[PDB]
Symmetry: C2
Subunit: 126 residues, 2 copies
C-alpha cells in the first residue's frame, strides 16, 4: 500500500512550477486541505509527498512547463503526474497504485494551505 514503509511516494520534476496536494476524504467530517508547493529550481527537483493521518484520499497535480513523474519506493518505474484536477494523480488510502481521478468538485471546499502542506522538495545538500 502506498505511503507504508517500502512504498513511499516520490516526485521528480523539471523546471520551476507548483506541486499542489489536495488532502481529502477526512474521517469524522474533517475538512479537506489544498496547498501548492512552489519550486524555483531550473533543473530536476526531487520531492517526498506525505499523507496526513485521518484522511483517506490524496490527489496531486503539477503546474509547470516541465515534466513531472512519480516513483513508488525504490521501484524503477517513473510515470507522469497529473497536470489538472480533472486528471489528477490520486491515491485512495490502502491502494498500491496511483490512479487518475477527477477531483474538480472537491477543490472548492478545501482550506488553502499553500506553502504549508505535506509535500516537500528535497534540497541540494541532502
Amino acid at each position: 500500500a502506498i505511503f507504508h514503509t517500502g512504498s513511499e511516494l516520490f516526485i521528480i520534476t523539471r523546471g520551476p512550477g507548483k506541486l499542489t496536494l489536495l488532502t481529502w476524504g477526512g474521517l469524522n467530517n474533517l475538512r479537506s486541505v489544498i496547498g501548492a508547493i512552489p519550486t524555483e529550481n531550473t533543473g530536476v527537483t526531487k520531492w517526498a509527498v506525505s499523507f496526513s493521518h485521518n484522511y483517506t484520499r490524496f490527489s496531486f497535480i503539477w503546474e509547470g512547463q516541465g515534466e513531472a513523474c512519480y516513483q513508488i519506493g525504490n521501484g524503477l518505474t517513473r510515470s507522469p503526474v497529473g497536470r489538472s484536477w480533472s486528471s489528477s494523480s490520486t491515491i485512495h488510502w490502502g491502494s498500491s497504485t496511483v490512479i487518475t481521478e477527477d477531483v474538480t468538485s472537491v477543490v472548492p471546499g478545501a482550506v488553502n494551505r499553500d506553502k504549508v502542506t505535506t509535500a516537500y522538495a528535497l534540497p541540494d545538500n541532502l
Copy 2:
C-alpha cells in the same frame, strides 16, 4: 516555521535502526499516533519527516547504534536527534526551532502505526 516550504524537516542516520515519530496535540481529541520506521541500511540513510494536518506537536527519536541528525531545509547545520522519549526531538507547530522535550507521558496514549506514519527513508535510486 518548520514544515513550511523552505523549512522542511530532513534526517540523516548511519547504520540500521528505527526512526520513530510521535504525532500529538491533535485537534479536538484526535488520537495521538506513534510509529517506528525501520531501516536496514548499513551506511547513510536520508529521510523526509512530515507533519499531519490537525496535529500541533511532533516528536521523534532514533534508536540505533549509529548517529542521527536533523537538517532544516537547505540549511547546512546538522544537529543530533534525540535518542529516548525523555529527551525527544520535538517541534511545536509554528516554531522554527527543534527543542528537547520529555514526552514519556504522551507515548502510552498513542495509537501504534509502525511502518505507516509520516516519516520516509529515501531510496537508493532517487
